[PDB]
């Protein structure tokens, strides 16, 4: 059954629960952006309405072919009524189109619900810091003290300076970068542009770019493989076995590939600096794990909770467990002692 935390007390609203069938009393169904666990459910014989972002909405349009009569699409950063309930819809710093939503209850209550999100000090500065917030459905991802990582701006000089030194050296090598979503365009876009290329992918991955309002997109992307020295392939080809198969596709243009798996978090994290970073070398072939993440640190998280002092913190990730739960629970507290709120 639908699960608590999916659903907006005094409302009609649920947020990301599209695979739970019609649920009982849903008069709104919030989509926060176009990853699959989150809008899993969804197809073109969906019938109710579904409140997102213009970028969300092309997604749903021109990917999952949602009829255009149920997409309602909100601009950002605007006071807007649904069903009777004053909304706004905040960029939440993770992949295109993502946000977080407040809402205005009727009895006073205000709630956010952030999505998925990477909390920034720019977010004191938004909306949120205009009013109370009562209550927080909080994207605990990384929700424990050893989740460090570096700024995306650190990880991109990392990528952009490794590139363009292994293509200087060597003209004849190809860059390839790993992908299975929206999210982390900036990798991709930062190189090609060092090595003054076009980006070359699949038809459906051009499409997917195509819905994200990208300015001068055109410019920065093609399907023209051969064209092109920076190419996209799915992640689950960024292997020896699956680059040395696409290197022979190529026919001897290339002789060299580097390659980049974004990843999360991975337990090299622990002891090494981005500085330090070293890769997987099997020949003529070469691929760095660099850590780009689109979730809030653990520090970027207590930070954020402690610049707004909710009085109750509701976890959207990690719930699954007794220990989990427990964990999170302790960490809030310590950050309320702390803090005084
Ligand atoms: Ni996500």
């Excluded at 500085?275 to 691929?287: C, L, R, Y």
């Excluded at 760095?288 to 979730?295: L, T, V």
Aim: proline share 5%.
């Amino acid at each position: 059954t639908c699960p608590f935390y999916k659903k907006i007390p005094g409302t009609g609203f649920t947020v990301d629960a599209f695979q739970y069938g019609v649920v009982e009393g849903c008069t709104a169904y919030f989509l926060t952006h176009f990853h699959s666990d989150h809008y899993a459910g969804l197809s073109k014989h969906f019938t109710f309405p579904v409140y997102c972002s213009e970028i969300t909405g092309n997604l749903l349009k021109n990917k999952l072919h949602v009829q255009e009569q149920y997409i309602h699409p909100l601009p950002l950063d605007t006071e807007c009524i649904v069903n009777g309930v004053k909304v706004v819809l905040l960029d939440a710093n993770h992949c295109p189109g993502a946000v977080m939503i407040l809402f205005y209850l009727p009895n006073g209550t205000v709630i956010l619900h952030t999505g998925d999100f990477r909390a920034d000090p720019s977010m004191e500065r938004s909306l949120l810091a205009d009013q109370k917030v009562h209550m927080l459905y909080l994207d605990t991802t990384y929700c424990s003290p050893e989740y460090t990582f570096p700024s995306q701006q650190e990880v991109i000089r990392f990528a952009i300076n490794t590139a363009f030194e292994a293509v200087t050296l060597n003209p004849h090598a190809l860059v390839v970068c790993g992908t299975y979503s929206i999210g982390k365009e900036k990798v991709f876009l930062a190189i090609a542009d060092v090595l003054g290329s076009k980006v070359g992918m699949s038809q459906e991955k051009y499409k997917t770019l195509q819905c994200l309002n990208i300015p001068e997109i055109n410019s920065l992307i093609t399907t023209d493989m051969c064209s092109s020295l920076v190419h996209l392939l799915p992640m689950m080809q960024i292997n020896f076995k699956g680059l040395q198969s696409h290197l022979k596709k190529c026919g001897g243009k290339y002789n060299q590939i580097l390659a980049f798996r974004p990843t999360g978090w991975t337990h090299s994290n622990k002891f090494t600096r981005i500085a330090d970073v070293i890769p997987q070398t099997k020949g003529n072939i070469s691929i760095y794990g660099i850590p780009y993440s689109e979730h809030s640190s653990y520090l970027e998280m207590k930070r954020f909770v402690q610049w707004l002092k909710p009085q109750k913190i509701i976890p959207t990730v990690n719930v699954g467990t007794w220990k989990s739960r427990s964990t999170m629970e302790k960490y809030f507290r310590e950050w309320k002692l702390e803090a005084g709120y």
